[model samples]
Target: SFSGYLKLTDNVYIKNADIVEEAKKVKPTVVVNAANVYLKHGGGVAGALNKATNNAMQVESDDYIATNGPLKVGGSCVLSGHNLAKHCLHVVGPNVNKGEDIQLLKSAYENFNQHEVLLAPLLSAGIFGADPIHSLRVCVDTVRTNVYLAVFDKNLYDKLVSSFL
Candidate 1:
């Protein structure tokens, strides 16, 4: 799936403003949702996305999860929207499975089959429970140079591998 898309310029930045400011520069066609299957987007990157997409992602979007079973930890599903982009890639990370979280996130990246390039918050970090180092590796490995990593949390922004700009 990644092969179908053009090679992208993957960059990293610290998040201070709402949403990912770097993404605004690039105008990414898709953004990742660090969310549960429910996709409330109520907190963390998900919350910011909720506001960023203008509530198009909220309000009964969870049915996709309900009928399909909860998103596999580290698996992703594409949602219907043109708010932030034409679509929202919703990923669920392995909550307590630390060792496997990286792999799961890697899988999540793999499952993002629709778009070639995108903006993504750190996968599986924060309340999802993985650390910045490991989570960053997954993003680097899977998405490679085709993504803009949005380091949203203050602590995470400080610890990210790519120096903040």
Candidate 2:
């Protein structure tokens, strides 16, 4: 399902691909959901991931929230995966609307190091409203060890290649 791929470093990669399909293909891998503080998988990457798992992720995430309270910005929680991947890591990226420290985005990417293999989207760049290129720059700088960014946008992909290549 990859449209393109690039090695940004020894351990990091950028791919023009779909996270859902990539999750299906890679066994024993964890997928990262750019999540809300409540861990609600309502739309965007979160929704697709939960839909792919038949809402099991939502159920589990709800349970997690009930037990742990709302996940903090820059924090993550893991859910047992029922499909697509063996586990799902949900991270709440900073909301620019709240004037949250944009660099807190790096804390989310830093979490990727704990997992052996991760597939992630550009954190905070979606509805959270961070600049796509700025988000990509942070991800490229901090991500390591078998991390893949599944970028679905053609313009963003071109920028990724032109700027980083």
Candidate 3:
């Protein structure tokens, strides 16, 4: 139920909202799935999206990997959103602890800059163990369009606000 915004420009901004719910709105939004290289929809935003579409998205995701191979760090692929949104842009963010750098992190956000509206969770911050602050900044710097960055937990939101200020 929380909402806020950080405007990058008159038309480009990062809003704190529920990514999934916003993607389902009448506007054609692209939900950024904080995905793994394999495109598995296990937990975090990936799980929520898969659950929202009753695992149909997972089926398509599996097929994508089967056809195109495992995604590289900072790479992305698009999928039909199955009523969740107009499309799902699956981005593989780098695991910083595992030697991935900010350039790769920036690459993840940059891949979908052409989209008009993007709803995203902080890629690599969950489960992947990248710092939310870094993820937040990279998202702020990388996109040229509107991005709804969802942060559901109050503690995590507080931590991010340190940088937000």
Candidate 4:
């Protein structure tokens, strides 16, 4: 389950570290999450983010849902003015297929027009599917703007080390 990790960018770090580490160095202009159409940050890295934001992420997410309804399969949604970081972006990944994963990546990073030390986890690696490297690969490629890939292993790392037998 553990493929590998590397520095894909100057600030891009792929290791078994927490997002808090980044907050220490950079101001974290924006943080990204692999969310559903309903914006449920209940498990994995999203869950950790939800907790860190005092669960206010969902509050803002719900407001987005109220304004725009459910996000489309290949659509990007940004929830700004967050209580966590400076802002938060949630992408709704495709269910039960890997093909939709790439579309989701494009949708996620489409409007990511600034390079302000953004923080993002590897999408489609949890809830949607299991593949950190590929997801990260697609994300960096799509977001032409400079970005910081937080690159935590909430899914791949845990699943691999879950059974220490």
| Top TM-score hit | 2
lDDT of each: 0.62, 0.82, 0.77, 0.61
- How many Å off is the CA of 130 in candidate 2? 0.9
Q: In candidate 4, residue 30 scores what lDDT?
A: 72
The positional error of residue 3 in candidate 1, measured at the CA in angstroms, is 24
- lDDT for position 12 in model 2: 70
Name the lDDT value of residue 156 in candidate 2.
82
Give stretches of model 4 more than 4 Å off.
Answer: 1-6, 9-15, 97-102, 113-116, 154-165
Q: Write the per-residue lDDT of candidate 2 for residues 58-138, one digit (tens) a residue.
A: 999999989999988998988876787778889888979778889899997888878877878889877778887888788
Model 2 spans > 4 angstroms off: 1-4
The window of 10 residues in a row where model 3 has the poorest summed lDDT is 1-10
Q: Write the per-residue lDDT of candidate 4 for residues 1-165, one digit (tens) a residue.
A: 112334555434354556545543454667766677677778876777777677787788888788888877655577762555677767665653545645556555554545544566666666666466566666666666555555455666554334212
Error of 2 at 60 (Å): 0.7
Highest lDDT scorer: 2
Regions more than 4 Å wrong, model 1 = 1-27, 97-102, 162-165
- For candidate 4, the C-alpha RMSD (Å) to the true structure equals 6.3
TM-score, candidate number 3: 0.85
Supply candidate 4's per-residue lDDT for 134.
60
Question: Would you list the rank order by TM-score, best first?
Answer: 2, 3, 1, 4
TM per candidate comes to 0.72, 0.91, 0.85, 0.71
Backbone clashes in model 3, listed as residue pairs: none
